């Protein structure tokens, strides 16, 4: 026979498939996966900084000081916050919370509080602060109320008009929480506060609020038709908050000093702490990957890849494998 030379291309035992415009599942010799699909399935630290895990508590319960939420008195700094879908310990006493989502958005900016007492229970001498407890909100087995706020009632058949104010002498911004009690009926408001038509006025340099408790025939939630409503504001340094009321006033005892502001988030997850550390975290679990993309969850925190809603993203590097 004569001598000859031929031209061809590479082949091997590869079975990696890729998709194109015209074809799906084309076996190629080499390929690059650019989508991270796996996670360890645990809630970890973020660069050695442990998150605040509220267990069965909500954010409202934590800040207001729910009796069941006794671990979360003076919490250390966090990388992120975790909260379950339907936390059983939210507002023990049936009630609402004004600008609750706005407050949660503000917690993304914050990494650490420091609780400080602004108005001690002892100071309320003209009023009876001992009572103002409630069943279905138990502390130590007994009827009780939120820890960080005081339910003030009458004293010796009298509720003198209140005029208090706290001046923020700290250098940090202060988160303050108060509330109003919407009474069950006219008989209850006379029983608790001795004043048919009361009011609650709150005023700072920025804020100026005027409130009045509403009477209504509401449905019995946890054996209590009467309802509570809580509010909040940031008191900047050197600014005072002026309280005035003659009834239905759920006064603050503690405020929260904003001592560190950085990157944080609140993530919906039923998972518990895993004693691990990671650079990237999701509600489903942590991601240790060098990929540019992933499909675990849209909400992440740390140094992560970007979230795609695809099941598969493979790039073809090599050529068509035959056979």
């Amino acid at each position, epitope marked *: 026979d004569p001598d000859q030379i031929c031209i061809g291309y590479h082949a091997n035992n590869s079975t990696e498939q890729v998709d194109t415009i015209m074809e799906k599942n084309v076996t190629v010799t080499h390929a690059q996966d650019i989508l991270e699909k796996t996670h360890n399935g645990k809630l970890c630290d973020l660069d050695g900084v442990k998150p605040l895990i509220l267990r069965d508590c909500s954010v409202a319960g934590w800040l207001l000081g729910n009796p069941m939420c006794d671990e979360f008195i003076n919490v250390p700094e966090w990388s992120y916050i975790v909260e379950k879908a339907n936390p059983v310990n939210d507002l023990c006493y049936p009630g609402d919370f004004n600008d609750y989502e706005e407050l949660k958005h503000l917690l993304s900016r914050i990494n650490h509080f*420091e609780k400080i007492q602004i108005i001690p229970k*002892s100071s309320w001498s003209s009023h009876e602060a001992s009572l103002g407890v409630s069943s279905a909100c138990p502390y130590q087995g007994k009827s009780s109320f939120f820890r960080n706020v005081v339910w003030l009632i009458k004293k010796d058949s009298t509720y003198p008009t209140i005029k208090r104010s706290y001046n923020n002498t700290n250098q940090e911004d202060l988160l303050v929480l108060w509330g109003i009690h919407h009474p069950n009926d006219a008989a209850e408001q006379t029983k608790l506060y001795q004043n048919p038509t009361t009011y609650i006025s709150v005023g700072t340099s920025t804020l100026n609020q005027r409130l009045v408790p509403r009477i209504a025939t509401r449905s019995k939630v946890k054996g209590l038709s009467g309802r509570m409503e809580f509010f909040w504001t940031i008191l900047k340094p050197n600014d005072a908050i002026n309280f005035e009321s003659n009834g239905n006033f759920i006064a603050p005892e503690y405020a929260y000093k904003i001592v560190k502001k950085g990157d944080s988030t609140i993530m919906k997850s039923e998972l518990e702490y895993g004693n691990c550390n990671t650079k990237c975290q999701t509600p489903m679990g942590a991601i240790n990957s060098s990929m540019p993309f992933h499909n675990i969850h849209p909400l992440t925190i740390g140094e992560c890849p970007k979230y795609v809603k695809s099941n598969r993203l493979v790039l073809a590097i090599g050529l068509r494998n035959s056979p």
Partner: antibody
């Protein structure tokens, strides 16, 4: 109502260890700060330190820190005060007293509204 | 620490006439809320110390009308309208703004005759 019963009285010699105690009743022991006050014979009151029995966070005095160990136990509503090696200068009367009931780390530490009977600790050769 | 200074050291007072004790602070005890974090305590002879005044001016449950606290910030005073054999003892003022808590030097008050 509120009751603070102490575990006096004690007599020891220099070098010996000691643990005086104080039992609170009529309230939530874990909720209130509880502490100790020394009064040497003929002299005034000397605040030693307090402890929050829920968290066991202790607020020592610089004069007494690292020299006496304050303790607390929720299970039997008891606060204590300890010594490693006693001296003649420790011969005094030690008052147990309830404080604030503030859960924060910066607040009105008073009123010191309920005091014990004191325990006489005598220390000599 | 916050050092506290009381005066006078001894105070002989006649049964009818009143009495007054000064208590000065090294640092302002006035809080952002408006209240002064200062208490007064009475130690009757042979007895333990007892709460008399808090927080600046309010009378403790069992304290008669004669006793009254006043002042603000750095300088305070405990006034007594009438004094009797029951009221003898060492009166202590103490600050409760910052840890560690500090008591005053004490004011011994006997009956004058």
């Amino acid at each position: 109502e509120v009751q603070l019963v102490q575990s006096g009285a004690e007599v020891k010699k220099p070098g010996e260890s000691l643990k005086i105690s104080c039992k609170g009743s009529g309230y939530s022991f874990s909720d209130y700060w509880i502490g100790w006050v020394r009064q040497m014979p003929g002299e005034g009151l000397e605040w030693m330190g307090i402890i929050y029995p829920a968290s066991s966070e202790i607020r020592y005095s610089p004069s007494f820190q690292g020299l006496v160990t304050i303790s607390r136990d929720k299970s039997i509503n008891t606060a204590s005060l300890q010594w490693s090696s006693l001296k003649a200068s420790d011969t005094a009367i030690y008052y147990c007293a309830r404080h604030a009931s503030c859960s924060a780390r910066s607040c009105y530490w008073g009123p010191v509204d309920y005091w014990g009977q004191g325990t006489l600790v005598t220390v000599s050769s | 620490d916050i050092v506290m200074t009381q005066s006078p050291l001894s105070l002989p007072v006649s049964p009818g006439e009143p009495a007054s004790i000064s208590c000065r602070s090294s640092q302002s005890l006035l809080h952002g809320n408006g209240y002064n974090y200062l208490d007064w305590y009475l130690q009757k002879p042979g007895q333990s110390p007892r709460l008399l005044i808090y927080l600046g001016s309010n009378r403790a449950s069992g304290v008669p009308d004669r006793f009254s606290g006043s002042g603000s910030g750095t300088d305070f005073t405990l006034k007594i309208s009438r004094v009797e054999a029951e009221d003898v003892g060492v009166y202590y003022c103490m600050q409760a703004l910052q840890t560690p808590l500090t008591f005053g030097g004490g004011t011994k008050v006997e009956i004058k005759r």
